[PDB]
Write a protein that binds this ligand. Sequence first.
Ligand code: CHL
Ligand code: CHL
Ligand code: CHL
Ligand code: CHL
Ligand code: CLA
Ligand code: CLA
Ligand SMILES: CC1=C[C@H](O)CC(C)(C)[C@H]1/C=C/C(C)=C/C=C/C(C)=C/C=C/C=C(C)/C=C/C=C(C)/C=C/C1=C(C)C[C@H](O)CC1(C)C
Ligand SMILES: CC1=C[C@H](O)CC(C)(C)[C@H]1/C=C/C(C)=C/C=C/C(C)=C/C=C/C=C(C)/C=C/C=C(C)/C=C/C1=C(C)C[C@H](O)CC1(C)C
Ligand SMILES: CC1=C[C@H](O)CC(C)(C)[C@H]1/C=C/C(C)=C/C=C/C(C)=C/C=C/C=C(C)/C=C/C=C(C)/C=C/C1=C(C)C[C@H](O)CC1(C)C
Ligand SMILES: CC1=C[C@H](O)CC(C)(C)[C@H]1/C=C/C(C)=C/C=C/C(C)=C/C=C/C=C(C)/C=C/C=C(C)/C=C/C1=C(C)C[C@H](O)CC1(C)C
Lengths: 219, 221, 221
Amino acid sequence: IEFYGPNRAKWLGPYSENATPAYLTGEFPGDYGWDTAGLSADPETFKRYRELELIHARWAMLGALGCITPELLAKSGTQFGEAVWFKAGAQIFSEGGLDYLGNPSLVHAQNIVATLAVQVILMGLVEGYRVNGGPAGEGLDPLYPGESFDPLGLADDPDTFAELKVKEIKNGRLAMFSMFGFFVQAIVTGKGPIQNLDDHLSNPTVNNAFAFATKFTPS
Amino acid sequence: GIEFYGPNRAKWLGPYSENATPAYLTGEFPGDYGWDTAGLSADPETFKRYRELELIHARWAMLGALGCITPELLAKSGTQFGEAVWFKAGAQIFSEGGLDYLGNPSLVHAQNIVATLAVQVILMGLVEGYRVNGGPAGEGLDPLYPGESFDPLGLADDPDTFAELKVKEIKNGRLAMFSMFGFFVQAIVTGKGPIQNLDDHLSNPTVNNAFAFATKFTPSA
Amino acid sequence: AIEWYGPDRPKFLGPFSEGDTPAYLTGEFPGDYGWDTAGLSADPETFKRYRELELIHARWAMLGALGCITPELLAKNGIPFGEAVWFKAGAQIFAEGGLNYLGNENLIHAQSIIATLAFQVVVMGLAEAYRANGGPLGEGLDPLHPGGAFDPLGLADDPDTFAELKVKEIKNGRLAMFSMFGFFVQAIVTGKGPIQNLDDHLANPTAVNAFAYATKFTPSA
Ligand code: CHL
Ligand code: CHL
Ligand code: CHL
Ligand code: CHL
Ligand code: CLA
Ligand code: CLA
Ligand SMILES: CC1=C[C@H](O)CC(C)(C)[C@H]1/C=C/C(C)=C/C=C/C(C)=C/C=C/C=C(C)/C=C/C=C(C)/C=C/C1=C(C)C[C@H](O)CC1(C)C
Ligand SMILES: CC1=C[C@H](O)CC(C)(C)[C@H]1/C=C/C(C)=C/C=C/C(C)=C/C=C/C=C(C)/C=C/C=C(C)/C=C/C1=C(C)C[C@H](O)CC1(C)C
Ligand SMILES: CC1=C[C@H](O)CC(C)(C)[C@H]1/C=C/C(C)=C/C=C/C(C)=C/C=C/C=C(C)/C=C/C=C(C)/C=C/C1=C(C)C[C@H](O)CC1(C)C
Ligand SMILES: CC1=C[C@H](O)CC(C)(C)[C@H]1/C=C/C(C)=C/C=C/C(C)=C/C=C/C=C(C)/C=C/C=C(C)/C=C/C1=C(C)C[C@H](O)CC1(C)C
């Protein structure tokens, strides 16, 4: 299998050759020939949508691992203020600060305002460096800089770098799908990801999604 | 000083923006800070339609922000309205005694919302079909800045400052669009007026900020 | 006025539509009224995918606008089957005896949503992927109007009335999408069925309209 060129991994299986647009030749990672809605025909808009997709994928990978990690560590012995991800933000206003791993001498943050301000300053600097350029690299690729990210030297050998690119964007698309799934499983249940996983693996017949199929009914 | 046209101008990321601006945003249009990071307006006709959408959104949001601030300021100054808060000012047509304009019963005294909406549909369809095509207030004109019936004070003359006034219009319009989005979301999550939220944030800014309402729309219930 | 093509055609603003209708909307497609005020379809590839998406939305909306009215239309005659509204029709799967088609117990009467869901996933993925690519009835043809076994009654010939029925299909489909969005929001705001809303409007139009439910989503907080 080759993930580039004319014959590649395609989203409708072995019969999708009518569904391929002309502009999706496959010179970029993760090209499956899926623009049947046709929003990415302009090549500059194709560039912008590709960098949008890759940074959404990377942030959703970080967000998926952050959705699953403290909830899994809640049953491994350590206990936090709140373990689910949709209440993991509200532990500021609880009395006794935001302990990081539950230990009161780790972070112990009571102020969300200065936390958001420090985050806004540092994140504005990081994203301005990411789009324009800065001290950890001035002019490079907009999506794959090198020489300070991947310092371990695994970005060389451009065929396995291409395989690493398509693997990165596929793991990221899976994590984006699962982040959307986390959002809707938050809104229709109110219980967390691995809490709903235990709810499914306890008895999967009734405790599938259709247990909450009548929640948002109108009156 | 700082300019807003040309190859170098005021940009969206500020000093860290010389690599950030796209190629198609060369800066001949008012409000070109180079923020098209999603590439929505790469085609120039899409860019033209989006400029028209942005400017008409800008003018309507300026009118809307002034109309959301005005009866609340007049109520906190002197005037007993029917309901001066803007997201409950619609139902004054159902106040069983009329919609008094400045709170006085000698004013417009509206009681039928269907006739009010219907004459609004008639007048708004007429005026917007005039805006896109032409009519009694100018036939062949610029679809965004007509002039000579919408400049009776002659401020579009000396066009080097008419470009500055175009940038001032789009900047107060984008600030009013941002403020109307803030009005909408503040109405949703606080339930009080923007001036009531301003008085709340001026009283105790440490807990009358947004983070006190962060647990309101919780996913548990 | 007897044409739906060419440079002169029926348009979405009527006589107010000369300053509209840009250069890439030429009237060459069924249903061209010059409505591209947002400018979303400048690229003809983007325009082609938007036309395909609009017409399959039109077909599914004409299916939906009739499939939502017929349960209440047979509840008009008095055939009782669990529930007649469409937005609370799925929960009849989870009834004491399951969802019945026409209420008579020797009919479909299925109980498990997951098994018929899996069957729907497999046959609809196969059918829609045959729609996009091609299968046992025509491999490479129009992605819009295949014909062949899709026209067993011979209405695809004589291409002028084929184009006329194309305009008829997209017009009834746009009316159906408008109706289905209206169905969605009449379900959201009112919480009753659309035919029940029609009975309530015909019983009392002046006080029971949408403006009666205008104060429902007011954020109290
Ligand atoms: C040959 C069979 C085959 C078919 C039919 C598909 C088709 C699909 N692939 Mg796939 N693939 C197939 C084989 C293969 N794929 C792939 C690789 C990929 C990738 C990388 C991706 C896909 C994706 C997709 C999906 C895109 C369509 C969509 O967005 O859903 C639209 C249709 C629906 C959503 C209908 C489903 C709804 C349900 C039936 C009804 C339920 C309604 C609810 C009640 C909700 C209603 C809400 C109410 C309250 C208003 C779809 C499931 C994409 C994806 O995962 O997108 C999600 C994607 O990223 N495929 C490979 C490897 C080369 C294949 C090999 O054979
Ligand atoms: C030098 C630093 C500098 C930086 C980093 C920026 C960057 C920015 N400028 Mg900018 N500017 C800068 C200097 C200058 N600007 C301008 C002129 C302008 C203008 C006219 C505009 C901007 C705008 C913007 C924004 C565009 C990106 C965006 O929309 O944010 C997106 C990212 C965020 C919003 C992240 C922040 C959110 C927060 C960290 C997360 C909080 C989460 C909440 C709890 C919510 C989560 C709960 C959920 C469930 C609801 C961004 C904040 C635009 C703007 O205001 O858009 C809003 C705009 O119109 N700038 C000038 C004058 C020449 C500058 C001079 O130096
Ligand atoms: C198009 C702009 C427009 C906006 C933003 C509003 C705003 C509102 N009106 Mg209002 N109206 C508008 C047009 C008109 N109204 C009325 C007459 C009434 C009456 C009689 C009533 C209202 C009420 C309301 C409120 C609904 C309560 C609610 O759900 O709050 C939650 C939602 C928000 C706070 C924000 C909603 C904005 C939205 C989510 C985003 C903006 C999208 C645009 C509205 C869509 C664009 C419209 C297009 C078609 C032009 C809401 C704040 C009710 C009210 O205030 O009573 C308590 C009410 O009884 N309106 C007429 C006829 C004269 C209008 C014609 O132009
Ligand atoms: C795709 C079209 C489709 C639509 C519009 C719906 C709609 C609905 N189903 Mg549903 N279904 C649909 C397909 C299917 N359903 C089911 C099986 C069930 C069951 C078992 C149940 C439902 C129920 C419901 C209702 C949830 C009540 C509610 O939350 O009101 C709020 C929502 C509205 C008022 C409609 C608002 C419209 C929406 C926001 C915009 C529409 C765009 C969608 C987001 C896109 C559709 C999804 C795509 C990806 C396929 C809701 C109206 C439940 C019910 O009726 O009891 C209350 C229920 O128990 N459905 C199957 C399996 C056979 C489907 C496959 O085709
Ligand atoms: C999602 C469905 C959908 C889609 C993809 C399209 C797509 C298209 N239409 Mg169609 N149309 C639709 C629904 C749709 N329309 C409906 C419901 C109506 C009746 C009101 C019409 C009436 C109509 C006319 C009269 C004409 C078109 C034309 C066009 C083309 C250019 C306009 C454009 O860029 O639209 C792009 C549209 C979208 C990308 C869809 C975005 C959907 C957003 C979310 C809607 C948001 C608005 C609001 C929130 C909901 C409705 C509010 C209120 C009206 C109730 C394009 C192929 C023109 C053309 O060239 O003819 C072929 C033309 O002359 N359409
Ligand atoms: C095919 C179009 C269509 C039709 C026939 C209906 C019919 C109906 N709707 Mg629905 N509706 C529609 C589209 C439609 N709607 C759409 C697109 C929306 C989203 C904006 C809504 C949102 C909506 C709500 C939220 C409610 C209704 C309600 C109603 C009922 C009373 C009428 C009313 O309050 O007006 C409401 C009409 C609108 C909000 C817009 C419809 C625009 C139509 C097409 C124009 C009608 C012209 C009219 C006769 C005269 C207008 C003034 C004139 C001088 C130009 C009635 C059964 C109410 C109900 O259930 O009453 C019991 C109710 O609560 N509708
Ligand atoms: C492809 C295509 C094609 C055709 O043509 C058309 C269409 C269809 C349009 C397209 C599609 C698209 C799509 C699907 C999209 C989607 C997206 C997403 C989902 C995203 C997410 C995304 C997501 C994301 C980012 C996420 C993120 C996350 C994060 C940061 C984190 C978070 C968190 C955490 C954990 C921690 C704590 O506790 C809390 C919080 C804070 C919460
Ligand atoms: C640039 C860019 C770039 C990249 O590429 C992409 C992206 C990101 C997408 C983009 C962005 C965008 C944005 C930002 C948007 C936003 C907007 C808005 C906010 C608007 C508003 C807008 C808004 C508006 C108009 C508003 C208006 C308003 C009004 C009239 C109001 C009225 C009123 C009043 C007076 C009061 C009373 O009692 C009632 C009412 C009735 C309520
Ligand atoms: C043209 C233009 C132009 C400018 O420039 C721009 C703009 C403005 C953007 C544009 C516009 C657009 C629009 C209007 C859109 C809309 C759309 C829609 C509404 C769709 C729907 C669409 C819709 C649809 C498909 C629907 C479908 C439906 C269905 C299937 C249903 C089903 C059902 C039934 C039977 C019954 C049962 O019991 C349940 C259920 C399941 C519920
Ligand atoms: C394909 C083919 C081919 C071959 O060749 C032949 C054949 C076979 C013949 C063909 C077939 C065809 C078909 C199937 C058709 C169908 C159609 C439809 C269903 C439509 C609907 C359609 C439908 C529609 C429009 C609808 C509409 C509606 C409207 C306006 C209104 C509504 C409403 C509303 C809103 C609300 C209230 O409360 C109620 C009402 C009043 C009710």
